[PDB]
Design a protein around this ligand. Structure first.
Ligand SMILES: [Mg+2]
Ligand SMILES: [Mg+2]
Ligand SMILES: [Mg+2]
Ligand SMILES: [Zn+2]
Lengths: 59, 100, 116, 208, 138, 79, 127
RNA sequence: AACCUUACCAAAUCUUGACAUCCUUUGACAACUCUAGAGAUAGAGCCUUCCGGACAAAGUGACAGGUGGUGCAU
RNA sequence: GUUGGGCACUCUAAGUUGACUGCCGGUGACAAACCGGAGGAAGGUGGGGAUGACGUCAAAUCAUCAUGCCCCUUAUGAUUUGGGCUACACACGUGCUACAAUGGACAAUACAAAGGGCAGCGAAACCGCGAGGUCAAGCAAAUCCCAUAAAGUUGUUCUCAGUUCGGAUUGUAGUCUGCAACUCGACUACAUGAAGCUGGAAUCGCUAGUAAUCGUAGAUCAGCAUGCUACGGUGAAUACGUUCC
């Protein structure tokens, strides 16, 4: 029931506490970094492709 | 004393150094009374992921995001150097911030 | 005897009061502030007048019998009306939102191993 | 044995972020912008042989730069098509965007272009084997020090999968100097989804 | 490594680093120094002298290696493992000499060993007993 | 409640109890609101609380004051 | 006059200025045995002197920051020993033979993912 | 994992649908109040205004939708 | 060090030097290489990471996503409220707290690192025993806050006890968050004070600033961490050696 809930979180909700983050391109709630509003997977995808500034795999 | 102070934030040292050198030479070319380039502690964040799709939390991939910070002051300004600084809107991946 | 129990004698007054059901360390320290005796002292060596001041003080508190009765009365109230908490009391299960799957050996009691 | 993307390994060492902008705070909007641009170029990308786009941003402007080998199909003849792009693209973004078509000659030396080609071939139902063969052939005629190619999935309409790869030359992944251009693509074949990976290594140079 | 400040000896520091729990060198230091003070109190003479005599007593000269059933075959103990085992047994059998304070425990242990008594000497003679018993297998 | 600024109760329930002030004695009152506290204004009014699958009746007493309807609408049917 | 040193050991930096005197040693405007508890620390501090018979010919003042007393003191030791060369370059050979000039690189290691520490893995069980 | 998340269960509800592309009526839009409902929800309003693209609804059948199965087709 | 002053020192961070068996001797097929030595901050891939060959396990994932075929489509789709994912005769795994004098309680006092911060970090003053509350400074950072590090040290006490150990459980009263903490948050004060005196057969980790132990920080996050990721402080024992698993 993904894309429904995508619409649902992208809507406002009757009170602010119900508001939750999911990644904007993949409707995935968990492992979201709210700076990027990306999940861990898509973070890897894009930072490997070079599409996310700053980022460089470390040590 | 009567000083301009400019902050450069960049994700890359080998470009922020040259941008700094540009603006510094422009100030001590179109004026005088310039401070040096001043490194600042260079923040770095780090986001840690599990290399997987479903489980295997034991494996990780650690990504750093550096943020180099480089400060310069122009002592005792003149409008020539003011103009030749504000008339340099370069480069792209560096946030300059003037303070007066 | 103070609250009906002749508390230990070699000890200091604070800790020897801690062996009263209803009197912990906070109240021990407050009571000794009230009736002026240094806690470094010891019940055997006290002046009996100081000990009497202490007992006058202590009388103004809910202690051994009253305390048990009050607690079990509060409990049995909710056991009777059969709240969630009252039923978990009735059944010897934990009350405070704990997990009853792997833990809870206290309220349950010892292991009763069933065969798989 | 579950090996990484070399561009992800090399970013910040010999090749630079395709996105070349700063924001202390507002990645929460600007990165999604970058991605939506990357997606909206489906228009061009469906035929125009676009390898990659770099992006830069300023206070006033966006400055984007799209690399290809058939640039006429994106600039029309005089500018009709780039203007067509500015209209809708700037309508999406709501910010003044200036673009820059840029040419990469030698189109059969570029990873994503090879991958696109072999994908469309395999959708036209050619043979994985001949495809990879002739790709590496023409690349080595163009004079690359190494090519590697791989296709994986239901080859020949087979009931189950395979992974077939070819190489000629040197593909030193663990060398970090090496600027090996990797590309992945897919092919929605009538039986399933063939996944193509391609690798070129066209001599050694540094960004500094 | 180094010798110790008060007494200038290697063994004392090597023993501190074996009494030490979780890197509490100063705690170990305190209790060993108070033990030397207390063994100067009782049995008045030098703490190093009585200590060195103690380890001369308990520090063994043989050992066994278990190999093959299972033979346990004797062997000549290395001179570093000598002091190693001496100090180890000293500390451990002190810890199980069972009284209030470890300084008292240690004081009594060095005392008994100085007089060729104590659990450490018992372990020594157990070791040599089983060694010579198994001497056939050398 | 956990704090002291004001207890809690659903308006759609309190409005209806106050409606039922007259005490006709035929009345019950349904609710899904297990979150509600029990003021002294509820004494005698039988409530029909939704347990998750069923509206269960409960009679209210002077001991149920600082308590909640969910405390008396069981949910997990263990035996 | 002065003879100076910059000792560093285990995220602890110490700026030493040897001067001739009695034997006093101040450390962040405090005396040694005020500042440091132990005494083998102080042995290690004074050991560079002991190599060269220079025990009382110098006072010390140090400005220090970082870490904790033990490595902080080994850093004092190192800066002292290096300043002693600025005062007397021929003691280099004795400090060499004794191994006093080596800045210990023994830094704390990086915790690694999948492990509960730099080396320690969790408790494993097949079953 | 308080609600949402939540995919499950009970009750209550909807059936071009919570979401997208199209035709046309259109239209700028509504916000924000009150009654009832457990809430979704309807119901009175409040007067919203073509800036031919755009927001907003509405009829429409194409259509959507599926955290449904196969990880032994990928 | 705050302010007038100096940027010497530390530090910060860009460029550079540096270490390469580079040199000395011996060994060795003279070769590679080994052993030792000098110098040097460091010596023998310096230490630690990142990087994981062809392929095996028809290993995992169709619930990140994408997708072939199959199936539901007035329902296997969609909306709200409430419940449940937190059950409980039991078994297994991973960890936390302890079973105390190398300690507990109280008092004074000392030295860190790596990190976060805008409608968020919330100093000070004040009220509250404490959770925290009122006002309100500074702060988009090497400025200000988070943020007093704790173990340690110095004293005093308790003096071997199921204890002044341990802090589970339960009772009452409260604080913060939130649309609301019964199911089902954390926290505090008081009261109570369980099991537990170092663990059977078995078995795990670790070769050095490691193990061990003490604190700290952060992502997720309104709120909730004994978990995860990361940081520093103190700091070992041993390696005979390859007969066995
Ligand atoms: Mg729900
Ligand atoms: Mg390698
Ligand atoms: Mg399988
Ligand atoms: Zn995502």
């Amino acid at each position: 029931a993904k894309t429904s809930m995508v619409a649902k979180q992208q809507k406002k909700q009757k009170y602010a506490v119900r508001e939750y983050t999911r990644c904007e391109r993949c409707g995935r709630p968990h492992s979201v970094y709210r700076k990027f509003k990306l999940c861990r997977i898509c973070f890897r995808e894009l930072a490997y492709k070079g599409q996310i500034p700053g980022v460089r795999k470390s040590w | 004393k009567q000083k301009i102070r400019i902050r450069l934030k960049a994700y890359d040292h080998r470009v922020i150094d040259q941008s700094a050198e540009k603006i510094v030479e422009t100030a001590k070319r179109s004026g005088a009374d310039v401070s040096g380039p001043i490194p600042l502690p260079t923040e770095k964040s780090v986001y840690t992921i599990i290399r997987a799709v479903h489980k295997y939390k034991d494996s990780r991939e650690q990504f750093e995001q550096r943020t180099h910070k480089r400060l310069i002051d122009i002592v005792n300004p003149t409008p020539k150097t003011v103009d030749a600084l504000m008339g340099l809107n370069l480069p792209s991946g560096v946030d300059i911030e003037i303070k007066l | 005897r103070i609250a009906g129990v002749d508390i230990p004698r070699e000890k200091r007054v604070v800790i020897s009061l801690t062996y009263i059901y209803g009197i912990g360390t906070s109240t021990a320290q407050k009571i000794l502030e009230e009736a002026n005796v240094s806690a470094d002292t010891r019940v055997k060596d006290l002046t009996d007048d100081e000990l009497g001041r202490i007992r006058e003080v202590v009388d103004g508190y809910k202690v051994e019998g009253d305390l048990r009765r009050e607690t079990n009365l509060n409990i049995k109230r909710l056991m009777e009306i059969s709240s969630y908490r009252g039923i978990r009391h009735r059944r010897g299960l934990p009350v405070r939102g704990q997990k009853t799957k792997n833990n809870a050996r206290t309220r349950k009691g010892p292991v009763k191993t069933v065969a798989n | 044995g579950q090996k990484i993307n070399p561009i992800g390994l090399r970013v910040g060492i010999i090749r630079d972020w395709e996105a070349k902008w700063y924001a202390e705070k507002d990645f929460a909007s600007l990165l999604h912008e970058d991605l939506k641009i990357r997606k909206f170029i489906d228009n061009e990308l469906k035929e125009a042989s676009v390898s990659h786009v770099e992006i830069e941003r300023a206070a006033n402007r966006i400055n984007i730069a799209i690399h290809t080998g058939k640039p006429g199909m994106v600039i029309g003849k005089g500018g009709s098509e780039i203007e067509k792009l500015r209209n809708k693209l700037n309508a999406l973004t709501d910010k003044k965007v200036h673009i820059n078509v840029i040419e990469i000659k030698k189109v059969d030396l570029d990873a994503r272009l090879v991958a696109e080609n072999i994908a469309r071939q395999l959708e036209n139902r050619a043979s994985f084997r001949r495809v990879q063969k002739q790709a590496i052939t023409r690349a080595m005629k163009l004079g690359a020090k190494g090519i590697k190619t791989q296709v994986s999935g239901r080859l020949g309409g087979a009931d189950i999968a395979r992974a077939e790869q070819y190489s000629e030359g040197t593909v030193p992944l663990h060398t970090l100097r090496a600027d090996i251009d990797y590309a992945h693509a897919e092919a929605d074949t009538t039986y399933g989804k063939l996944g193509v990976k391609v690798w070129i290594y066209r001599g050694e140079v540094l960004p500094t | 490594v180094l010798p110790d400040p008060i007494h200038n000896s290697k063994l004392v520091t090597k023993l501190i680093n074996k009494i030490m729990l979780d890197g509490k060198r100063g705690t170990a230091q305190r209790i060993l120094y108070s033990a030397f003070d207390l063994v100067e109190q009782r049995s008045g003479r030098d703490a190093l002298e009585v200590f060195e005599e103690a380890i001369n007593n308990i520090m063994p000269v043989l050992e066994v290696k278990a190999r093959r059933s299972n033979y346990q075959v004797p062997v000549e103990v290395r001179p570093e493992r000598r002091t190693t085992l001496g100090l180890r047994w000293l500390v451990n059998y002190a810890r199980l000499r069972g009284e209030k304070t470890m300084e008292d425990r240690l004081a009594n242990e060095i005392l008994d060993a100085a007089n060729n008594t104590g659990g450490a000497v018992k372990k020594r003679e157990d070791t040599h007993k089983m060694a010579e018993a198994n001497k056939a297998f050398a | 409640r956990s704090i002291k600024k004001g207890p809690f109760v659903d308006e759609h329930l309190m409005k209806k109890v106050e409606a039922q002030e007259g005490s006709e004695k035929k009345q019950v009152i349904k609710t899904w609101s297990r979150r509600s506290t029990i003021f002294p204004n509820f004494i005698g009014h039988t409530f029909a609380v939704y347990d998750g699958r069923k509206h269960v009746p409960v009679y209210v007493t002077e001991d149920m004051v600082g308590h909640k309807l969910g405390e008396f609408a069981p949910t997990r049917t263990f035996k | 006059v002065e003879y100076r040193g910059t000792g560093r050991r285990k995220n602890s930096v110490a700026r030493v200025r040897l001067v001739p005197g009695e034997g006093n040693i101040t450390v962040n405007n405090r005396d040694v045995r005020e500042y440091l508890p132990f005494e083998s620390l102080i042995l290690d501090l004074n050991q560079p002197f002991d190599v060269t018979e220079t025990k009382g010919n110098y006072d010390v003042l140090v400005n220090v920051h970082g870490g904790g007393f033990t490595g902080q003191a080994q850093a004092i030791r190192h800066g002292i020993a290096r300043a002693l060369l600025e005062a007397d370059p021929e003691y280099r050979g004795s400090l060499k033979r004794a191994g006093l000039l080596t800045r210990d690189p023994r830094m704390k290691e990086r915790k690694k993912p999948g492990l509960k520490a730099a080396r320690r893995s969790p408790q494993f069980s097949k079953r």
